[PDB]
Amino acid sequence: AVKKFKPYTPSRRFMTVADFSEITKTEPEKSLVKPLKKTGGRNNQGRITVRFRGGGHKRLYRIIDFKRWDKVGIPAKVAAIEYDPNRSARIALLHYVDGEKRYIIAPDGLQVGQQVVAGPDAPIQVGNALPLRFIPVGTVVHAVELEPKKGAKLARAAGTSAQIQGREGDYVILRLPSGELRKVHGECYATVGAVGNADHKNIVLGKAGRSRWLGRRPHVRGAAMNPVDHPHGGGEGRAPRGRPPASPWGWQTKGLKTRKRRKPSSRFIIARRKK
Amino acid sequence: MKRTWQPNRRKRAKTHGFRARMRTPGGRKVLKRRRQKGRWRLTPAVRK
RNA sequence: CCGAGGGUAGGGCCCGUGACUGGGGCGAAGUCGUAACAAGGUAGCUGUACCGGAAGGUGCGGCUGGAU
RNA sequence: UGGGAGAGGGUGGUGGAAUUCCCGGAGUAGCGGUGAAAUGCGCAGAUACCGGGAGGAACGCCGAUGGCGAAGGCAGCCACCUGGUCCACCCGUGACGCUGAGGCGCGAAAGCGUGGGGAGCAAACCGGAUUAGAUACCCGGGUAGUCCACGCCCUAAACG
RNA sequence: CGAUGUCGGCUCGUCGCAUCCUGGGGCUGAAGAAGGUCCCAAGGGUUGGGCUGUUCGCCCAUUAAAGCGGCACGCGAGCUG
RNA sequence: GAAUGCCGGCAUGAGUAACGAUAAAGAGGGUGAGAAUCCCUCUCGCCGUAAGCCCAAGGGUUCCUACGCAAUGGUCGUCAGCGUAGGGUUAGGCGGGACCUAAGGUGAAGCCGAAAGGCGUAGCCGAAGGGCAGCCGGUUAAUAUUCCGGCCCUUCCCGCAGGUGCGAUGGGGGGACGCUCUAGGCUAGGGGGACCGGAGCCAUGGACGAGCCCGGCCAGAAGCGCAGGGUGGGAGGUAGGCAAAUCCGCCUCCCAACAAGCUCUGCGUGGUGGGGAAGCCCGGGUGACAACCCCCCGAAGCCAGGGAGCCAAGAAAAGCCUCUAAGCACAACCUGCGGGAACCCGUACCGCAAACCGACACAGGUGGGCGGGUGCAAGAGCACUCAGGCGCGCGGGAGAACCCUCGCCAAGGAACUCUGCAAGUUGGCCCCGUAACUUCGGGAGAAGGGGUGCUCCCUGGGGUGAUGAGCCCCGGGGAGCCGCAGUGAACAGGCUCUGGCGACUGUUUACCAAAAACACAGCUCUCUGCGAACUCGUAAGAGGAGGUAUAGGGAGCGACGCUUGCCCGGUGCCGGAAGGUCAAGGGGAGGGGUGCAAGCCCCGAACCGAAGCCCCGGUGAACGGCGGCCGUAACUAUAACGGUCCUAAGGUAGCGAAAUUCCUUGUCGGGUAAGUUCCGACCUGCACGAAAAGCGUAACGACCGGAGCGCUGUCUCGGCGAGGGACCCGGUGAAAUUGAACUGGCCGUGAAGAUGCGGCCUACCCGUGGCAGGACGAAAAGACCCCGUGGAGCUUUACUGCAGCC
RNA sequence: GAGCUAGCCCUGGCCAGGGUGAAGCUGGGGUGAGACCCAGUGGAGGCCCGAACCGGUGGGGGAUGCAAACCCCUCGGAUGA
Ligand SMILES: O=C(CCCC[PH](c1ccccc1)(c1ccccc1)c1ccccc1)N[C@H](CO)[C@H](O)c1ccc([N+](=O)[O-])cc1
Ligand SMILES: [Mg+2]
Ligand SMILES: [Mg+2]
Ligand SMILES: [Mg+2]
Ligand SMILES: [Mg+2]
Ligand SMILES: [Mg+2]
Ligand SMILES: [Mg+2]
Ligand SMILES: [Mg+2]
Ligand SMILES: [Mg+2]
Ligand SMILES: [Mg+2]
Ligand SMILES: [Mg+2]
Ligand SMILES: [Mg+2]
Ligand SMILES: [Mg+2]
Ligand SMILES: [Mg+2]
Ligand SMILES: [Mg+2]
Ligand SMILES: [Mg+2]
Ligand SMILES: [Mg+2]
Ligand SMILES: [Mg+2]
Ligand SMILES: [Mg+2]
Ligand SMILES: [Mg+2]
Ligand SMILES: [Mg+2]
Ligand SMILES: [Mg+2]
Ligand SMILES: [Mg+2]
Ligand SMILES: [Mg+2]
Ligand SMILES: [Mg+2]
Ligand SMILES: [Mg+2]
Ligand SMILES: [Mg+2]
Ligand SMILES: [Mg+2]
Ligand SMILES: [Mg+2]
Ligand SMILES: [Mg+2]
Ligand SMILES: [Mg+2]
Ligand SMILES: [Mg+2]
Ligand SMILES: [Mg+2]
Ligand SMILES: [Mg+2]
Ligand SMILES: [Mg+2]
Ligand SMILES: [Mg+2]
Ligand SMILES: [Mg+2]
Ligand SMILES: [Mg+2]
Ligand SMILES: [Mg+2]
Ligand SMILES: [Mg+2]
Ligand SMILES: [Mg+2]
Ligand SMILES: [Mg+2]
Ligand SMILES: [Mg+2]
Ligand SMILES: [Mg+2]
Ligand SMILES: [Mg+2]
Ligand SMILES: [Mg+2]
Ligand SMILES: [Mg+2]
Ligand SMILES: [Mg+2]
Ligand SMILES: [Mg+2]
Ligand SMILES: [Mg+2]
Ligand SMILES: [Mg+2]
Ligand SMILES: [Mg+2]
Ligand SMILES: [Mg+2]
Ligand SMILES: [Mg+2]
Ligand SMILES: [Mg+2]
Ligand SMILES: [Mg+2]
Ligand SMILES: [Mg+2]
Ligand SMILES: [Mg+2]
Ligand SMILES: [Mg+2]
Ligand SMILES: [Mg+2]
Ligand SMILES: [Mg+2]
Ligand SMILES: [Mg+2]
Ligand SMILES: [Mg+2]
Ligand SMILES: [Mg+2]
Ligand SMILES: [Mg+2]
Ligand SMILES: [Mg+2]
Ligand SMILES: [Mg+2]
Ligand SMILES: [Mg+2]
Ligand SMILES: [Mg+2]
Ligand SMILES: [Mg+2]
Ligand SMILES: [Mg+2]
Ligand SMILES: [Mg+2]
Ligand SMILES: [Mg+2]
Ligand SMILES: [Mg+2]
Ligand SMILES: [Mg+2]
Ligand SMILES: [Mg+2]
Ligand SMILES: [Mg+2]
Ligand SMILES: [Mg+2]
Ligand SMILES: [Mg+2]
Ligand SMILES: [Mg+2]
Ligand SMILES: [Mg+2]
Ligand SMILES: [Mg+2]
Ligand SMILES: [Mg+2]
Ligand SMILES: [Mg+2]
Ligand SMILES: [Mg+2]
Ligand SMILES: [Mg+2]
Ligand SMILES: [Mg+2]
Ligand SMILES: [Mg+2]
Ligand SMILES: [Mg+2]
Ligand SMILES: [Mg+2]
Ligand SMILES: [Mg+2]
Ligand SMILES: [Mg+2]
Ligand SMILES: [Mg+2]
Ligand SMILES: [Mg+2]
Ligand SMILES: [Mg+2]
Ligand SMILES: [Mg+2]
Ligand SMILES: [Mg+2]
Ligand SMILES: [Mg+2]
Ligand SMILES: [Mg+2]
Ligand SMILES: [Mg+2]
Ligand SMILES: [Mg+2]
Ligand SMILES: [Mg+2]
Ligand SMILES: [Mg+2]
Ligand SMILES: [Mg+2]
Ligand SMILES: [Mg+2]
Ligand SMILES: [Mg+2]
Ligand SMILES: [Mg+2]
Ligand SMILES: [Mg+2]
Ligand SMILES: [Mg+2]
Ligand SMILES: [Mg+2]
Ligand SMILES: [Mg+2]
Ligand SMILES: [Mg+2]
Ligand SMILES: [Mg+2]
Ligand SMILES: [Mg+2]
Ligand SMILES: [Mg+2]
Ligand SMILES: [Mg+2]
Ligand SMILES: [Mg+2]
Ligand SMILES: [Mg+2]
Ligand SMILES: [Mg+2]
Ligand SMILES: [Mg+2]
Ligand SMILES: [Mg+2]
Ligand SMILES: [Mg+2]
Ligand SMILES: [Mg+2]
Ligand SMILES: [Mg+2]
Ligand SMILES: [Mg+2]
Ligand SMILES: [Mg+2]
Ligand SMILES: [Mg+2]
Ligand SMILES: [Mg+2]
Ligand SMILES: [Mg+2]
Ligand SMILES: [Mg+2]
Ligand SMILES: [Mg+2]
Ligand SMILES: [Mg+2]
Ligand SMILES: [Mg+2]
Ligand SMILES: [Mg+2]
Ligand SMILES: [Mg+2]
Ligand SMILES: [Mg+2]
Ligand SMILES: [Mg+2]
Ligand SMILES: [Mg+2]
Ligand SMILES: [Mg+2]
Ligand SMILES: [Mg+2]
Ligand SMILES: [Mg+2]
Ligand SMILES: [Mg+2]
Ligand SMILES: [Mg+2]
Ligand SMILES: [Mg+2]
Ligand SMILES: [Mg+2]
Ligand SMILES: [Mg+2]
Ligand SMILES: [Mg+2]
Ligand SMILES: [Mg+2]
Ligand SMILES: [Mg+2]
Ligand SMILES: [Mg+2]
Ligand SMILES: [Mg+2]
Ligand SMILES: [Mg+2]
Ligand SMILES: [Mg+2]
Ligand SMILES: [Mg+2]
Ligand SMILES: [Mg+2]
Ligand SMILES: [Mg+2]
Ligand SMILES: [Mg+2]
Ligand SMILES: [Mg+2]
Ligand SMILES: [Mg+2]
Ligand SMILES: [Mg+2]
Ligand SMILES: [Mg+2]
Ligand SMILES: [Mg+2]
Ligand SMILES: [Mg+2]
Ligand SMILES: [Mg+2]
Ligand SMILES: [Mg+2]
Ligand SMILES: [Mg+2]
Ligand SMILES: [Mg+2]
Ligand SMILES: [Mg+2]
Ligand SMILES: [Mg+2]
Ligand SMILES: [Mg+2]
Ligand SMILES: [Mg+2]
Ligand SMILES: [Mg+2]
Ligand SMILES: [Mg+2]
Ligand SMILES: [Mg+2]
Ligand SMILES: [Mg+2]
Ligand SMILES: [Mg+2]
Ligand SMILES: [Mg+2]
Ligand SMILES: [Mg+2]
Ligand SMILES: [Mg+2]
Ligand SMILES: [Mg+2]
Ligand SMILES: [Mg+2]
Ligand SMILES: [Mg+2]
Ligand SMILES: [Mg+2]
Ligand SMILES: [Mg+2]
Ligand SMILES: [Mg+2]
Ligand SMILES: [Mg+2]
Ligand SMILES: [Mg+2]
Ligand SMILES: [Mg+2]
Ligand SMILES: [Mg+2]
Ligand SMILES: [Mg+2]
Ligand SMILES: [Mg+2]
Ligand SMILES: [Mg+2]
Ligand SMILES: [Mg+2]
Ligand SMILES: [Mg+2]
Ligand SMILES: [Mg+2]
Ligand SMILES: [Mg+2]
Ligand SMILES: [Mg+2]
Ligand SMILES: [Mg+2]
Ligand SMILES: [Mg+2]
Ligand SMILES: [Mg+2]
Ligand SMILES: [Mg+2]
Ligand SMILES: [Mg+2]
Ligand SMILES: [Mg+2]
Ligand SMILES: [Mg+2]
Ligand SMILES: [Mg+2]
Ligand SMILES: [Mg+2]
Ligand SMILES: [Mg+2]
Ligand SMILES: [Mg+2]
Ligand SMILES: [Mg+2]
Ligand SMILES: [Mg+2]
Ligand SMILES: [Mg+2]
Ligand SMILES: [Mg+2]
Ligand SMILES: [Mg+2]
Ligand SMILES: [Mg+2]
Ligand SMILES: [Mg+2]
Ligand SMILES: [Mg+2]
Ligand SMILES: [Mg+2]
Ligand SMILES: [Mg+2]
Ligand SMILES: [Mg+2]
Ligand SMILES: [Mg+2]
Ligand SMILES: [Mg+2]
Ligand SMILES: [Mg+2]
Ligand SMILES: [Mg+2]
Ligand SMILES: [Mg+2]
Ligand SMILES: [Mg+2]
Ligand SMILES: [Mg+2]
Ligand SMILES: [Mg+2]
Ligand SMILES: [Mg+2]
Ligand SMILES: [Mg+2]
Ligand SMILES: [Mg+2]
Ligand SMILES: [Mg+2]
Ligand SMILES: [Mg+2]
Ligand SMILES: [Mg+2]
Ligand SMILES: [Mg+2]
Ligand SMILES: [Mg+2]
Ligand SMILES: [Mg+2]
Ligand SMILES: [Mg+2]
Ligand SMILES: [Mg+2]
Ligand SMILES: [Mg+2]
Ligand SMILES: [Mg+2]
Ligand SMILES: [Mg+2]
Ligand SMILES: [Mg+2]
Ligand SMILES: [Mg+2]
Ligand SMILES: [Mg+2]
Ligand SMILES: [Mg+2]
Ligand SMILES: [Mg+2]
Ligand SMILES: [Mg+2]
Ligand SMILES: [Mg+2]
Ligand SMILES: [Mg+2]
Ligand SMILES: [Mg+2]
Ligand SMILES: [Mg+2]
Ligand SMILES: [Mg+2]
Ligand SMILES: [Mg+2]
Ligand SMILES: [Mg+2]
């Protein structure tokens, strides 16, 4: 579950923390961490291109195995489950009978000391990876590639999962976490099960300081600015929007579809998302 | 209170120095113009 | 030393009262409708929820203390 | 000790019919709805027919004046975990019992919180009729909710 | 308009009299006492509070009386703001 | 002769303001032409978590010494951070380079751009981070971890001896990490000693004393001791660590394991080298053959890469160890020892300031370390004071008004005023005690009160010792003493009741606004399937993100509680393969120019022909909107009810004279002797209302209202006192302003407010301290207002383009 | 031109002292087992008081200033955005 606090400060009243109970190792593997270059939202020109970024806790980036068809047939023991600051899910440390060590994102139900494997012949069990054209229709799955050998792209966030809905030619039909129905090539790898740490979404940040620890600087409404800054700027006293609600750059932000209409992906997208 | 000039020799050499001017076209013109005018010092003096 | 009591300060309970406000009872010589008693003209009653000038309605479940 | 019946409860799985939606075919002038209608849907190809897919809820015949539970209540099918109850043997214990203010637990529906889910249904709501009027009954829509997990609520014509 | 600072208050006054009081008068529907009204008169006097930024005004308690106006709606090189 | 003209010169204000912290001065003696100001002595005062000491920036000779005083120095000057001259900065170990990387910068390959140029993995550069070997004392006028002394150490080269499969820019280990809390043992620093050393002192009534005053240490290789840090050993298998690998990783087996051992560090001791006070005497000598010991306190520093807990999950690369490849195995490397070798730059002095940033020797600003003692609960607070440093570069008088900063005040006590503005009161610690309401944390230091010094006596536990003495620490119970007063001085909340707004901590208009504004957790809508959307860029490339719908972007709303109604006709957005309109292009009935002709050239209807717009539908936590008239009930009054106009639909819950109410000080109630404010109500709401959210809400607020208690010079209503000015004398000596002036009152006149015109009145000449009514006083070519076919920012269904998108 | 200022990036450093006493853990009570209750321990927090440090609330002074934003008194934050 998620952990509550007694209200001994104004902010501890609603603040809630992850219970951190599936974790067995509190230190990262040294050969698998590299420094994460903080950007602040700035680009190679030095310009802010994503607003209100920066000042978050320092982090080392843990290298994650998003291929796994790397080591077809070679099993590995689940040695430990770790915290990872660079993603919502937890990471599992794998010990291969090869001797090689690697990281995957922990599916829900992984056990320390469990054996997992990856390949066309792999058992359909939580933690194993297979090409999609071998996972039985119906089973939920995660860490799905979008194209063969290009890396796991779908269902990598905490609690997320995709389900296989059928097969058509060289393609399987997936229901992504958004509800979109998508053709994905049958030779794209995936890992049977759902991503763990599903209680992530019930966390209550609790105070402005917690947002800041995460590298999220305070966001400022256009309505609180001036006409030089935002379409919603100016006005005497408070003001309604007085125009279709817009972004800082003028485009409308209530309903306007923005996917590129002629994108070739459309041939493979069965049904736009829900909700 | 704290004023605008807070001297710093590395900041002075790396900002206005000769090598900084020679990199940029606008910097080479600054030197061309100061040499045309007959300036005694083409760049600020920094002690290193 | 204790000490009637007086003094300062903070509490607890009760009683009288208060602009105004809530429903209740009774009065009957009114206005609106007709909710219930006949299958009372939508069987009724019911806990609850939402709603409507009003009696009331409807949903969900329950009872027969329901006519044929 | 031995045996029996049962929708008693809890958990995880799985089966088929049907409704709705979407994809393909084929086909055209209405369909739907009512006491009669209209709103509604339909030449932007509906309804009726065939194939495929998706999803949720409830389990037809068996089913009955039936069965089970302390009550609320429990109904497709498989398994696991588990309660109560009856019978025959008359073997063990030797009044160890009855009740029960307080207490604790359970407690239909509706309602509440957090998060899923959402096909059908349907408060509120919108429209059509009915009518003297019709904030209703009847018709076309339709959101909570009804469903699942966890925590509250603790009511009833909770009745025999 | 190459600037004459604008409401109210405080302080400091000074002047006019169409006089609020005190002084002197005529008439009264002036018995007395107390008033009404008009004339003469500017020497002095003309309170303390509650409300509001207020000027004003209402109100409390008094008073012989609680006057009204001018001085750049007197006075920011005097203060307040 | 005027341009608030330009440059320069010199006046006026004026012997006026001022001479830069109110920390403070006096005298004696010297020097000298000249002395409040320079040097010396004595007395006084100020700083002492500095106003003392060290370091990094920045400054650049300001350092030392001699000789000087024109200018600089707010006066003076014989002095100086000033003038002239001479001297002064010494390193293998301290800092930087001949080492490593961080962001960033540059950039073989490579990519992009009219040119200039933009990017870019590796590499290179880049430090106050990593790494790396020096401590104490002495010496100079001036440098010292640099010279000297004592004791240590590092690297490179060569040689010798031993040992080993040696060898790397390649593989691996390591380097290597957060915040809060914290153990043990140390050291830095400190207090005490009746003990050790010491020049001396006996005052003024007493004291020859367990007297007074002074000091009682610093470094130190190997070894040893104490405390820690780090590290398991063996064998077999091996398909992984872009080759190899005996290394590392993985699996299994066996002794070992909170041990030891091995290794490293800190502290102690340590051969040895140093230092060494007060006082007296002229920085030096003496004290002195100085003593150099014990007890107590004890770090935030050290052992250290220690321990624990927590979530926000906490650099890199080289040095180093290991592994092997080419190679090489007479070499090569490792260990010990020896001899040789060891370069470049900095080093003065200032450094919280008179030497840096502020035009000034400027009350401002400036990063790190040390920062003693006593007392007050603690402490870096406060008072005093050590070492050390100062008395602030004009003085002497006087004792006015007035100003400033401060002290007191009879009786009253907010009567002051826009407001208790300001100033009082309160004040630390210990104990007793403490309300509504509440999200159960709080509100709370609630409120309110009692205690507080010193003396004696009895006594409980702790630390260090040893279990004792001593030292130090936390208490208890008695009995007394003094004063007006015991946190006796300094530092240290006034409190309560009740509304508005915002949940809260935060943030903001550098330099007139700190708030109710911004942000904020949280709520909802919406976009985005990843070469994501979106953002920056012509592009390449980037951010997003080494993220993947429990994610990222945009918007509104803003803890939490209870909630969030009706209108989709207009605008927006979403969906809609039909229809209507639609450009280039396709098409070519037909028509034209020309030539004698084949031919060449032009126009050109039907029909075909995208998006968009029209059209159908959806959509409000999208832009937004949410009525009017007549009539009706046993008296009046009102209208549950009916009728009728209009609309896309006529404001629901809640709230309401409100941060909204014009009329308005609505009416009534409460508080007051009196209440335009405040609180509670009513509702004809000029002109609330539901995420530009509605109504509430404990806690919070240097926010804004209303009331009270306490206490006050706020006031009645003022008085006195203090210091710094104001004044007088000596020294230095500005400023805005200034047509020129020989510059009076009244009643008038005058461009309508006259020192300057008329009449009359008044008036001897010139200053000093004072006050501010006038000189439409000074300052700023009015910010308001208008005007100019003047400008700029912003807006849109103004016009016309452009990017971007289709 | 970011040696002032604003934001971010890399790498360092600073925050006396005192007060409150969350989770957890241990013991006891409690039950069929629990919830939970008490005590000791513990040491949480955009927690409390208050120096450094960062500020700039109210008032007074200053106004050709010590200062082209200063001074005094008072006041806000002070393990955190
Ligand atoms: O305009 C002004 C003087 C306005 C000065 C206000 P200011 C100031 C300037 C100098 C000296 C004193 C005060 C100021 C105003 C603007 C800019 C700078 C300074 C100020 C200072 C503080 C607070 C408020 C104002 N007088 C004009 C004559 O030209 C005239 O008499 C006048 C016309 C119309 C009204 N009228 O009531 O309409 C009032 C007065
Ligand atoms: Mg909580
Ligand atoms: Mg807690
Ligand atoms: Mg809890
Ligand atoms: Mg709170
Ligand atoms: Mg936890
Ligand atoms: Mg976990
Ligand atoms: Mg879990
Ligand atoms: Mg770590
Ligand atoms: Mg690394
Ligand atoms: Mg990275
Ligand atoms: Mg990065
Ligand atoms: Mg770059
Ligand atoms: Mg650039
Ligand atoms: Mg962006
Ligand atoms: Mg940013
Ligand atoms: Mg994680
Ligand atoms: Mg999580
Ligand atoms: Mg959340
Ligand atoms: Mg973070
Ligand atoms: Mg946000
Ligand atoms: Mg915002
Ligand atoms: Mg604004
Ligand atoms: Mg701008
Ligand atoms: Mg614009
Ligand atoms: Mg704009
Ligand atoms: Mg606007
Ligand atoms: Mg507006
Ligand atoms: Mg606005
Ligand atoms: Mg407005
Ligand atoms: Mg605004
Ligand atoms: Mg606004
Ligand atoms: Mg606002
Ligand atoms: Mg709006
Ligand atoms: Mg607007
Ligand atoms: Mg609008
Ligand atoms: Mg694709
Ligand atoms: Mg300057
Ligand atoms: Mg600086
Ligand atoms: Mg300089
Ligand atoms: Mg520098
Ligand atoms: Mg530097
Ligand atoms: Mg620099
Ligand atoms: Mg340069
Ligand atoms: Mg020259
Ligand atoms: Mg130059
Ligand atoms: Mg008595
Ligand atoms: Mg009836
Ligand atoms: Mg009926
Ligand atoms: Mg009605
Ligand atoms: Mg209804
Ligand atoms: Mg029943
Ligand atoms: Mg009946
Ligand atoms: Mg579905
Ligand atoms: Mg049946
Ligand atoms: Mg039955
Ligand atoms: Mg028997
Ligand atoms: Mg129930
Ligand atoms: Mg639905
Ligand atoms: Mg009607
Ligand atoms: Mg609802
Ligand atoms: Mg709901
Ligand atoms: Mg329900
Ligand atoms: Mg029954
Ligand atoms: Mg004017
Ligand atoms: Mg002028
Ligand atoms: Mg008479
Ligand atoms: Mg009479
Ligand atoms: Mg008369
Ligand atoms: Mg007469
Ligand atoms: Mg008179
Ligand atoms: Mg007179
Ligand atoms: Mg008035
Ligand atoms: Mg009288
Ligand atoms: Mg007047
Ligand atoms: Mg005037
Ligand atoms: Mg007038
Ligand atoms: Mg007037
Ligand atoms: Mg006036
Ligand atoms: Mg005036
Ligand atoms: Mg003024
Ligand atoms: Mg005035
Ligand atoms: Mg004046
Ligand atoms: Mg004047
Ligand atoms: Mg005033
Ligand atoms: Mg004002
Ligand atoms: Mg002329
Ligand atoms: Mg002039
Ligand atoms: Mg001139
Ligand atoms: Mg000139
Ligand atoms: Mg002259
Ligand atoms: Mg003068
Ligand atoms: Mg001066
Ligand atoms: Mg002198
Ligand atoms: Mg002299
Ligand atoms: Mg001297
Ligand atoms: Mg001290
Ligand atoms: Mg200089
Ligand atoms: Mg020197
Ligand atoms: Mg010199
Ligand atoms: Mg001189
Ligand atoms: Mg001289
Ligand atoms: Mg001079
Ligand atoms: Mg001089
Ligand atoms: Mg000077
Ligand atoms: Mg001389
Ligand atoms: Mg000097
Ligand atoms: Mg010399
Ligand atoms: Mg040396
Ligand atoms: Mg070299
Ligand atoms: Mg390098
Ligand atoms: Mg370095
Ligand atoms: Mg070194
Ligand atoms: Mg040494
Ligand atoms: Mg020297
Ligand atoms: Mg080797
Ligand atoms: Mg690391
Ligand atoms: Mg580090
Ligand atoms: Mg911290
Ligand atoms: Mg001590
Ligand atoms: Mg003694
Ligand atoms: Mg020891
Ligand atoms: Mg191997
Ligand atoms: Mg000596
Ligand atoms: Mg001797
Ligand atoms: Mg001797
Ligand atoms: Mg500390
Ligand atoms: Mg550690
Ligand atoms: Mg976390
Ligand atoms: Mg790196
Ligand atoms: Mg070979
Ligand atoms: Mg060896
Ligand atoms: Mg060299
Ligand atoms: Mg030196
Ligand atoms: Mg200072
Ligand atoms: Mg300092
Ligand atoms: Mg200046
Ligand atoms: Mg000076
Ligand atoms: Mg200074
Ligand atoms: Mg010391
Ligand atoms: Mg004290
Ligand atoms: Mg104290
Ligand atoms: Mg202090
Ligand atoms: Mg002392
Ligand atoms: Mg002085
Ligand atoms: Mg005098
Ligand atoms: Mg003073
Ligand atoms: Mg006295
Ligand atoms: Mg008094
Ligand atoms: Mg009083
Ligand atoms: Mg009193
Ligand atoms: Mg007040
Ligand atoms: Mg109370
Ligand atoms: Mg409570
Ligand atoms: Mg609290
Ligand atoms: Mg108290
Ligand atoms: Mg209170
Ligand atoms: Mg005493
Ligand atoms: Mg003091
Ligand atoms: Mg005090
Ligand atoms: Mg206080
Ligand atoms: Mg209160
Ligand atoms: Mg509010
Ligand atoms: Mg605010
Ligand atoms: Mg606030
Ligand atoms: Mg709130
Ligand atoms: Mg806030
Ligand atoms: Mg400001
Ligand atoms: Mg400003
Ligand atoms: Mg300014
Ligand atoms: Mg400004
Ligand atoms: Mg402000
Ligand atoms: Mg504030
Ligand atoms: Mg703001
Ligand atoms: Mg805000
Ligand atoms: Mg909310
Ligand atoms: Mg762009
Ligand atoms: Mg790129
Ligand atoms: Mg990227
Ligand atoms: Mg990236
Ligand atoms: Mg992402
Ligand atoms: Mg908020
Ligand atoms: Mg906000
Ligand atoms: Mg509540
Ligand atoms: Mg609409
Ligand atoms: Mg519309
Ligand atoms: Mg409609
Ligand atoms: Mg519009
Ligand atoms: Mg058709
Ligand atoms: Mg033709
Ligand atoms: Mg022709
Ligand atoms: Mg709405
Ligand atoms: Mg809504
Ligand atoms: Mg409209
Ligand atoms: Mg709107
Ligand atoms: Mg009537
Ligand atoms: Mg209205
Ligand atoms: Mg409504
Ligand atoms: Mg009202
Ligand atoms: Mg009123
Ligand atoms: Mg209101
Ligand atoms: Mg209004
Ligand atoms: Mg009005
Ligand atoms: Mg009003
Ligand atoms: Mg008004
Ligand atoms: Mg009135
Ligand atoms: Mg008021
Ligand atoms: Mg009214
Ligand atoms: Mg808004
Ligand atoms: Mg508003
Ligand atoms: Mg709204
Ligand atoms: Mg606040
Ligand atoms: Mg505030
Ligand atoms: Mg006074
Ligand atoms: Mg005195
Ligand atoms: Mg004086
Ligand atoms: Mg005096
Ligand atoms: Mg003349
Ligand atoms: Mg006049
Ligand atoms: Mg005149
Ligand atoms: Mg005259
Ligand atoms: Mg004349
Ligand atoms: Mg004349
Ligand atoms: Mg004449
Ligand atoms: Mg004349
Ligand atoms: Mg005269
Ligand atoms: Mg004057
Ligand atoms: Mg004047
Ligand atoms: Mg004049
Ligand atoms: Mg004037
Ligand atoms: Mg001016
Ligand atoms: Mg001009
Ligand atoms: Mg003008
Ligand atoms: Mg003008
Ligand atoms: Mg005008
Ligand atoms: Mg025009
Ligand atoms: Mg014109
Ligand atoms: Mg313009
Ligand atoms: Mg776009
Ligand atoms: Mg760092
Ligand atoms: Mg701190
Ligand atoms: Mg405790
Ligand atoms: Mg624990
Ligand atoms: Mg804080
Ligand atoms: Mg705090
Ligand atoms: Mg605090
Ligand atoms: Mg201030
Ligand atoms: Mg004050
Ligand atoms: Mg004062
Ligand atoms: Mg100051
Ligand atoms: Mg101060
Ligand atoms: Mg704070
Ligand atoms: Mg504080
Ligand atoms: Mg603190």
Author numbering:
A (entry chain 1D): 2 to 276
B (entry chain 17): 1 to 48
What do the study's own words say?
The majority of antibiotics suppress pathogenic bacteria, and thereby cure infections, by selectively inhibiting their ribosomes—molecular machines that are responsible for protein biosynthesis. Chloramphenicol (CHL) is one of the oldest and the most well-studied ribosomal drugs that target the catalytic peptidyl transferase center (PTC) located at the heart of the large ribosomal subunit (50S) where peptide bond formation occurs. As with many other PTC-targeting antibiotics, CHL binds to the ribosome in the A-site cleft, a crevice between the bases of nucleotides A2451 and C2452 of the 23S rRNA, where the aromatic nitrobenzyl ring of CHL establishes π–π stacking interactions with the nucleobases of A2451 and C2452. At this location, the ribosome-bound CHL competes with the amino acid side chains of the incoming aminoacyl-tRNAs (aa-tRNAs).
